[PDB]
From a paper:
S1 contains an N-terminal domain and a receptor binding domain (RBD) that recognizes the target cell receptor angiotensin-converting enzyme 2 (ACE2). Here, we describe the molecular basis of the SARS-CoV-2 RBD recognition by the anti-RBD monoclonal antibody CoV11 isolated early in the COVID-19 pandemic and show how its unique mode of binding the RBD determines its neutralization breadth. CoV11 utilizes a heavy chain VH 3-53 and a light chain VK 3-20 germline sequence to bind to the RBD. CoV11 binds the RBD in what has become the characteristic mode of binding for VH 3-53 encoded SARS-CoV-2 neutralizing antibodies by closely overlapping the ACE2 binding site on the RBD.
To get a better understanding of how CoV11 recognizes SARS-CoV2 spike, we determined the crystal structure of CoV11 Fab in complex with the wt and the delta (B.1.617.2) variants of the SARS-CoV-2 RBD. CoV11 Fab-RBDdelta crystallized in two different space groups, P212121, which diffracted to 2.05 Å, and C2, which diffracted to 2.4 Å. Both crystals had one CoV11 Fab-RBDdelta complex in the asymmetric unit. The orthorhombic delta RBD P212121 crystal form was refined to an R/R free of 0.177/0.208 and the monoclinic delta RBD C2 crystal form was refined to an R/R free of 0.179/0.224. Delta contained two mutations in the RBD, Leu452 to Arg and Thr478 to Lys. The CoV11 Fab-RBDdelta complex shows that although these mutations sit outside of CoV11’s epitope footprint, they do make small changes to the way CoV11 binds to the RBD. The most notable difference is in how the N-terminus of the Fab sits relative to position 478 in the RBD. The glutamic acid at the N-terminus of CoV11 is approximately 9 Å from ThrRBDwt478 but 5 Å from LysRBDdelta478 . In the wt RBD, TyrCDR H3102 and PheRBD486 display aromatic π stacking interactions, but in the delta RBD, the closer N-terminus shifts TyrCDR H3102 such that it cannot interact with Phe486. Most other differences are minor, which is mirrored by the less than twofold reduction in binding affinity for the delta RBD as compared to wt.
Residue numbers in the entry:
A (entry chain A): 334 to 529
B (entry chain H): 1 to 82, 82A, 82B, 82C, 83 to 100, 100A, 100B, 101 to 128, ...
C (entry chain L): 1 to 10, 12 to 28, 28C, 29 to 108, 108A, 109 to 214
Write the structure that this text describes.
């Protein structure tokens, strides 16, 4: 009954940010120590909780969302941010309660010749709602003429590729991100840290 | 047809305000990354501001807090509200559509000139440069105006070959002066009238001057 | 913040030659985020290349972009007189989100062309107002370097003239230049012979154009 964080953090392939993955965690013992005692993480920011006291708390359930973005975009995975990622790919609510963990994955997700598997949504009519996941690939109409599913002037495929090559500067390197959100409804708590 | 037409530029005193507007055709402003980019006279391009289709806005450090970009969906137009203008904001302002990795800044308006200065508007005086004589040269001296620009055409646009309208130069008086000249066959002096049409929109000055051998 | 340094600042090449323009970024950027623009005088910039190498719509094949990391290049093969312009690189991947280089001005060489010189007395209308502008015109020359010396009753005049030069013509690659001598009406009426003497590489010896006030 021990929470499967290894399935999340150590997955061989991560999702593209536009199609971010979500793992529901329930009915298990958390043990966040293995996370916050790791030197491997370039970012570990918590909101509404103390990482210190994580191992002594309970929640109705936990969500672990995971994806890959550019280094320069990690700052956008936080309440109250704007930008292409927060606006069109992955949006945290203002009242977010949880942790954002990010680490440089240049060794896994960069390829000499450039890895282009990971994509982000560049065109969208409006901002995502918090925790909204948009996976449409409909041609984006930027002008007054209908696209009818054909790419051309003013008719753009909405997803665009990151170009991850090992010699990129760090702001252009891929980072793996896991967002833990902690959910407290009005039901029995099924995710507790080891001291509970 | 797609286009971006800008307007609202003109002369303003330091500390003043101006609102630029950019009317789009074809492009749906609310569906695009729309940017303002400016170019001071003789200098390079400097990005000013962007608005995302979702509404997010971003600004260059040098205009933050003073400029506000916005749009009117029903009018399909983009606006730049400029407050607390200073001399360093004098420039041609372009609106443009940005496509980021899908195509960078692929379409630009033609620009509108904003002059931030204490000097008052003054309309030009237009004097003929009469042909003296093969080839003859003749022209118009457009003197003592502010601010830029003046436009000069010849014979209402019918005469464009051999025309040189020179860049304005600031005189020591703080006023601009420029010449427009044209070279024509000397014979044509007897068989064709030459009129220069000078337009200084900032002072609402429209002058047509007939240039004849003295 | 990232800085884009273009080099060289100016370039002078003949038609048919090959221009190589460089852009060095102060930090490594991914090649997907670099673009090149061409700006002809009095016009908006025109996109040439995006994503370091992709030709924009309307860009001919003789324009080609390359590079990565901190160094990017725009190459213009089989140069043409119409390629005279300022070229700018731009990055759009790093904060603040857009940065332009300071530009490389490209001038197109051509065969030496001596100027045609014309001199214009002030008009009577202007004189009536109390000022006299005497204009000297140098028309369609190359190269740009020219010396215009005003002489009034053979005294060389300094400090009371201003020059203005056109941008290189897009078709014949020549320049024109205007030199204006400004005087009060009284000073103008003190003298008889007004002359502008022009020195230029394509002139065997200086060319003088003059008039006598009143005649
Ligand atoms: C991922 O694998 C490493 C291998 O050393 C392990 O130490 C770490 O605890 C794993 N992450 C988990 C279980 O969240």
């Amino acid at each position: 009954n021990l929470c499967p964080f290894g399935e999340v953090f150590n997955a061989t392939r991560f999702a593209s940010v536009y199609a971010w993955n979500r793992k529901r965690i329930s009915n298990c013992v958390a043990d966040y120590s293995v996370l916050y005692n790791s030197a491997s993480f370039s970012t570990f920011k918590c909101y509404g909780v103390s990482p210190t006291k994580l191992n002594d708390l309970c929640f109705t359930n936990v969500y672990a969302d995971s994806f890959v973005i550019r280094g320069d975009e990690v700052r956008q995975i936080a309440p109250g941010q704007t930008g292409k990622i927060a606006d069109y790919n992955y949006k945290l609510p203002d009242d977010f309660t949880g942790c954002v963990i990010a680490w440089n994955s240049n060794n896994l997700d960069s390829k000499v010749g450039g890895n282009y598997n990971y994509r982000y949504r560049l065109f969208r009519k409006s901002n995502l709602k918090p925790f909204e996941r948009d996976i449409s690939t409909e041609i984006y109409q930027a002008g007054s003429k209908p696209c009818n599913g054909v790419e051309g002037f003013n008719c753009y495929f909405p997803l665009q590729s990151y170009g991850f090559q090992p010699t990129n500067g760090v702001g252009y390197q891929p980072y793996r991100v896991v967002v833990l959100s902690f959910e407290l409804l009005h039901a029995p708590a099924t995710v507790c840290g080891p001291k509970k | 047809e797609v286009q971006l037409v800008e307007s609202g530029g003109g002369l303003i005193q330091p500390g003043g305000s101006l609102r630029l507007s950019c009317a789009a055709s074809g492009f749906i402003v609310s569906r695009n990354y729309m940017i303002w980019v400016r170019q001071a006279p003789g200098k390079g391009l400097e990005w000013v501001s962007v608005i995302y289709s979702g509404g997010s806005t971003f600004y260059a450090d040098s205009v933050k807090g003073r400029f506000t970009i916005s749009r009117d969906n029903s009018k399909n137009t983009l606006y730049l509200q400029m407050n607390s203008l200073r001399a360093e904001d004098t420039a041609v302002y372009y609106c443009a559509r940005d496509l980021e990795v899908a195509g960078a800044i692929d379409y630009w308006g033609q620009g509108t000139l904003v002059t931030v200065s204490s000097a008052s508007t003054k309309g030009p005086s237009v004097f003929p440069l009469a042909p003296s004589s093969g080839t003859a040269a003749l022209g118009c001296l457009v003197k003592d105006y502010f601010p830029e620009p003046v436009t000069v055409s010849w014979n209402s646009g019918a005469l464009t070959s051999g025309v040189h309208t020179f860049p304005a130069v600031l005189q020591s008086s703080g006023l601009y002066s420029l010449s427009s000249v044209v070279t024509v066959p000397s014979s044509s002096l007897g068989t064709q009238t030459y009129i220069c049409n000078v337009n200084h929109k900032p002072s609402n000055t429209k002058v047509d001057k007939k240039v004849e051998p003295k | 913040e990232i800085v884009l340094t273009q080099s060289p600042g100016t370039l002078s090449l003949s038609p048919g030659e090959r221009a190589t323009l460089s852009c060095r970024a102060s930090q490594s950027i991914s090649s997907s985020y670099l673009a090149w623009y061409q700006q002809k005088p009095g016009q908006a910039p025109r996109l040439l290349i995006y994503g370091a190498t992709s030709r924009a719509t309307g860009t001919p094949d003789r324009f080609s972009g390359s590079g990565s990391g901190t160094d990017f290049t725009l190459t213009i093969n089989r140069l043409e007189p119409e390629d005279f312009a300022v070229y700018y690189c731009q990055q759009y991947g790093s904060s603040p989100g857009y940065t332009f280089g300071q530009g490389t001005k490209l001038e197109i060489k051509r065969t030496v062309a001596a100027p045609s010189v014309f001199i214009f007395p002030p008009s009577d209308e202007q004189l009536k107002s109390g000022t006299a502008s005497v204009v000297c015109l140098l028309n369609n020359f190359y190269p740009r370097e020219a010396k215009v010396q005003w002489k009034v009753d053979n005294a060389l005049q300094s400090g009371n003239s201003q020059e203005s030069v056109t941008e290189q013509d897009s078709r014949d690659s020549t320049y024109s230049l205007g030199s204006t001598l400004t005087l009060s009406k009284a000073d103008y009426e003190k003298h008889k012979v007004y002359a502008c003497e022009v020195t230029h590489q394509g002139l065997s010896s200086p060319v003088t154009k003059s008039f006598n006030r009143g005649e």
